[PDB]
Scaffold this active site. Structure first.
Site, short mmCIF file in Angstrom:
data_model
loop_
_atom_site.label_atom_id
_atom_site.label_comp_id
_atom_site.label_asym_id
_atom_site.label_seq_id
_atom_site.Cartn_x
_atom_site.Cartn_y
_atom_site.Cartn_z
N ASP A 8 -8.64 1.91 8.33
CA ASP A 8 -9.99 1.90 8.90
C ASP A 8 -10.02 1.01 10.18
O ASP A 8 -8.95 0.65 10.68
CB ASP A 8 -11.06 1.58 7.85
CG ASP A 8 -11.01 0.14 7.39
OD1 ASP A 8 -10.22 -0.64 7.91
OD2 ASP A 8 -11.80 -0.22 6.49
N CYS A 65 -6.36 -1.94 5.76
CA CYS A 65 -7.79 -2.25 6.00
C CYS A 65 -7.89 -3.76 6.02
O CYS A 65 -6.86 -4.45 6.16
CB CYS A 65 -8.74 -1.55 4.98
SG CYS A 65 -8.66 -1.92 3.15
N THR A 67 -8.46 -5.99 3.73
CA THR A 67 -7.68 -6.64 2.68
C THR A 67 -6.54 -5.79 2.14
O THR A 67 -5.71 -6.30 1.40
CB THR A 67 -8.52 -6.97 1.47
OG1 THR A 67 -9.08 -5.75 0.98
CG2 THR A 67 -9.66 -7.96 1.84
N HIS A 98 10.71 -1.61 -8.71
CA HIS A 98 10.13 -1.40 -10.03
C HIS A 98 9.12 -0.27 -10.10
O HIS A 98 9.12 0.49 -11.07
CB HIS A 98 9.50 -2.71 -10.59
CG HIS A 98 10.52 -3.75 -10.93
ND1 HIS A 98 10.24 -4.91 -11.63
CD2 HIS A 98 11.87 -3.76 -10.73
CE1 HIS A 98 11.35 -5.62 -11.79
NE2 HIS A 98 12.35 -4.94 -11.26
N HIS A 133 12.21 1.40 -15.43
CA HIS A 133 11.16 1.49 -14.42
C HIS A 133 10.73 2.94 -14.25
O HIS A 133 9.58 3.19 -13.86
CB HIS A 133 11.59 0.85 -13.10
CG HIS A 133 12.16 -0.51 -13.27
ND1 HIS A 133 11.40 -1.57 -13.74
CD2 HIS A 133 13.44 -0.98 -13.17
CE1 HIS A 133 12.18 -2.63 -13.89
NE2 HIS A 133 13.42 -2.30 -13.55
O1 AOS Z 1 7.22 -3.78 -13.12
C1 AOS Z 1 6.88 -4.29 -14.19
C2 AOS Z 1 6.33 -5.74 -14.33
O2 AOS Z 1 6.26 -6.55 -13.10
C3 AOS Z 1 7.16 -6.47 -15.41
O3 AOS Z 1 6.33 -7.59 -15.70
C4 AOS Z 1 8.72 -6.71 -15.03
O4 AOS Z 1 9.19 -5.75 -14.03
C5 AOS Z 1 9.82 -6.69 -16.17
O5 AOS Z 1 10.72 -7.79 -16.10
C6 AOS Z 1 10.80 -5.55 -16.07
O6 AOS Z 1 11.29 -5.38 -17.38
O1 AOS Z 2 -12.76 -2.49 1.97
C1 AOS Z 2 -13.29 -2.70 3.07
C2 AOS Z 2 -12.36 -3.06 4.28
O2 AOS Z 2 -11.73 -4.35 4.08
C3 AOS Z 2 -13.11 -3.03 5.65
O3 AOS Z 2 -12.06 -3.23 6.63
C4 AOS Z 2 -14.39 -4.01 5.66
O4 AOS Z 2 -15.22 -3.69 4.50
C5 AOS Z 2 -15.36 -4.20 6.90
O5 AOS Z 2 -16.38 -5.18 6.58
C6 AOS Z 2 -16.12 -2.96 7.38
O6 AOS Z 2 -17.51 -3.09 7.11
#
Ligand code: AOS
Ligand code: AOS
Lengths: 148, 148
Positions: A8, A65, A67, A98, A133
């Site tokens: 965005d 975006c 965040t 993973h 995985h």
């Molecule tokens: O992807 C899975 C999670 O991060 C698990 O907590 C971790 O990967 C686990 O050690 C794999 O067995």
């Molecule tokens: O999830 C929203 C995004 O982080 C946008 O970049 C943000 O909300 C912005 O304030 C637009 O109004």
């Protein structure tokens, strides 16, 4: 390897920087927009990148975006998409090793430019580890089949 | 309100800490497991918390694994769930204000205990801001309806 990228207005400037970084490294990049600072809706661009990944038109995607959260949640609504919001290289590596993530999500207001380039470099280079995985990724697929 | 919590064995110890933190603050806590350090699959626990939030049996949920990524991706496959992986209070606040997140995802191997309690505190207190954010949440709903 082809990388779709989208954002965005909250992720637009970081998107331009990442597009530039990826080309310099010889990736083919498809930019799904947005294409300026005008206010737009993160799910529309989340969708475009996620659908280009699902259709094989991109091999993987990066969505940005403020965040990373909104656009990654929206990307993950698509069956077959595993979008990982990463704020450091460790998460980026694990999301590949993973979770076999095929979309990387970033927050332009959370990670500074050079950190975000480190994360993208790590994520592009890391490799899926299969094994247990893959089993767990199938269980994600079973959620998708349940609500399909 | 009532808070559902769940984890794999990667998020189990932090889950125990957050459960204790939440009860001390007078929340009702529904623990969906896992219940030890035995190796388990993050999608199963992500699903339990997400379905409890969807069915109104919990008002919000918190899911925990090594990074938060896998369990939040799985949670997000459920229609009506918006699971936010946060590594700082800023993301936690925005995930409420902007994305109206009803699940918080945390990674026990990424954020230390006191940081994670700060994030939980911030997330539980933040409030949805509506307006253009409601519009965007609806567009996430359109993705769900498309792949339903
Ligand atoms: O992807 C899975 C999670 O991060 C698990 O907590 C971790 O990967 C686990 O050690 C794999 O067995
Ligand atoms: O999830 C929203 C995004 O982080 C946008 O970049 C943000 O909300 C912005 O304030 C637009 O109004």
């Amino acid at each position: 390897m082809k990388i779709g990228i989208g954002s965005d207005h909250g992720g637009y400037n970081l998107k331009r920087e990442i597009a530039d970084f990826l080309k310099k490294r010889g990736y083919e990049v498809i930019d799904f927009g947005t294409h300026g600072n005008e206010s737009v809706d993160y799910p529309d661009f989340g969708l475009k990148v996620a659908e280009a990944v699902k259709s094989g038109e991109c091999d993987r995607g990066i969505v940005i975006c403020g965040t990373g959260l909104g656009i990654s949640i929206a990307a993950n609504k698509v069956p077959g998409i595993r979008a990982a919001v990463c704020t450091n290289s460790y998460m980026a590596r694990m999301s590949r090793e993973h979770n076999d993530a095929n979309i990387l999500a970033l927050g332009e207001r959370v990670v500074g430019l050079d950190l975000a380039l480190d994360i993208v470099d790590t994520w592009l280079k890391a490799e899926f580890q299969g094994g247990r995985h893959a089993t767990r990724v199938g269980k994600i697929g079973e959620i998708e089949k349940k609500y399909s």
